[PDB]
Symmetry: C4
Subunit: 25 residues, 4 copies
Amino acid sequence: SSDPLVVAANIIGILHLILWILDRL
Amino acid sequence: SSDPLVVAANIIGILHLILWILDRL
Amino acid sequence: SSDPLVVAANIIGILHLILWILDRL
Amino acid sequence: SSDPLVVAANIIGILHLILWILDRL
Ligand SMILES: CCCCCCCC/C=C\CCCCCCCC(=O)OC[C@H](O)CO
Ligand SMILES: CCCCCCCC/C=C\CCCCCCCC(=O)OC[C@H](O)CO
Ligand SMILES: CCCCCCCC/C=C\CCCCCCCC(=O)OC[C@H](O)CO
Ligand SMILES: CCCCCCCC/C=C\CCCCCCCC(=O)OC[C@H](O)CO
Ligand SMILES: CCCCCCCC/C=C\CCCCCCCC(=O)OC[C@H](O)CO
Ligand SMILES: CCCCCCCC/C=C\CCCCCCCC(=O)OC[C@H](O)CO
Ligand SMILES: CCCCCCCC/C=C\CCCCCCCC(=O)OC[C@H](O)CO
Ligand SMILES: CCCCCCCC/C=C\CCCCCCCC(=O)OC[C@H](O)CO
Ligand SMILES: [Ca+2]
Ligand SMILES: [Ca+2]
Ligand SMILES: [Ca+2]
Ligand SMILES: [Ca+2]
Ligand SMILES: [Cl-]
Ligand SMILES: [Cl-]
Ligand SMILES: [Sr+2]
């Protein structure tokens, strides 16, 4: 398990990556 | 919970994202 | 140990970095 | 504490940020 703030930050990080890829695609 | 260095790195990562968005906005 | 979602996100983050470097190289 | 791979990934992430800032500066 992780600190809740770390889980949240990682979810945000992944969504950022998805949105970046979709933007470029 | 997380390693303190990981918590710190994630806080920095999120602030970086906020500042990036504000810069572009 | 970390949340499995955090491990996964970090692996993805590192692969992203590798692919970015290889793209620029 | 965190998975060792997560600690490593976060250290790499921070160094990446430092090198990016120094490059732009
Ligand atoms: C291109 C712009 C960058 C992208 C902008 C996207 C910002 C998304 C913000 C919030 C959604 C994600 C947050 C989800 C947080 C849920 C709470 C949580 O995960 O807590 C778990 C905890 O471990 C339980 O105690
Ligand atoms: C248009 C773009 C579409 C937007 C798509 C964005 C999806 C975000 C991706 C992953 C976060 C969701 C993962 C949620 C699972 C979290 C539960 C967890 O944190 O721990 C589970 C672990 O396996 C047990 O400890
Ligand atoms: C665009 C440039 C990139 C952005 C530049 C921003 C750099 C921010 C640096 C430090 C502030 C954040 C650090 C906050 C650290 C607090 C200590 C901590 O979080 O420790 C928790 C631990 O788990 C308890 O034992
Ligand atoms: C001009 C731009 C404005 C700058 C805005 C930047 C704000 C940084 C965002 C989040 C870090 C703060 C989150 C602090 C909470 C940390 C406590 C924690 O780490 O764990 C809590 C958990 O819910 C129990 O384990
Ligand atoms: C340039 C585009 C960005 C790059 C696109 C790359 C996307 C890669 C996606 C998935 C592979 C990585 C996921 C590996 C996940 C394995 C599952 C896991 O790690 O779970 C561990 C857990 O702790 C055990 O319970
Ligand atoms: C063309 C580009 C080539 C692609 C290359 C991408 C490689 C991805 C890098 C690291 C993820 C693999 C690390 C796997 C180890 C995970 C096991 C773990 O999570 O914990 C281990 C810890 O030491 C005990 O707790
Ligand atoms: C611009 C290019 C991107 C930047 C390229 C930089 C790549 C740096 C690679 C490795 C150094 C960092 C790795 C340090 C890893 C030490 C091992 C560790 O941290 O393990 C802790 C564990 O928790 C104990 O069991
Ligand atoms: C030219 C550029 C100069 C390069 C500069 C790059 C420095 C990398 C930054 C941070 C990683 C080092 C942090 C090492 C501390 C790790 C120990 C830890 O992981 O846990 C400690 C925690 O407080 C107890 O659990
Ligand atoms: Ca906490
Ligand atoms: Ca430690
Ligand atoms: Ca979980
Ligand atoms: Ca492990
Ligand atoms: Cl990142
Ligand atoms: Cl973690
Ligand atoms: Sr943990």
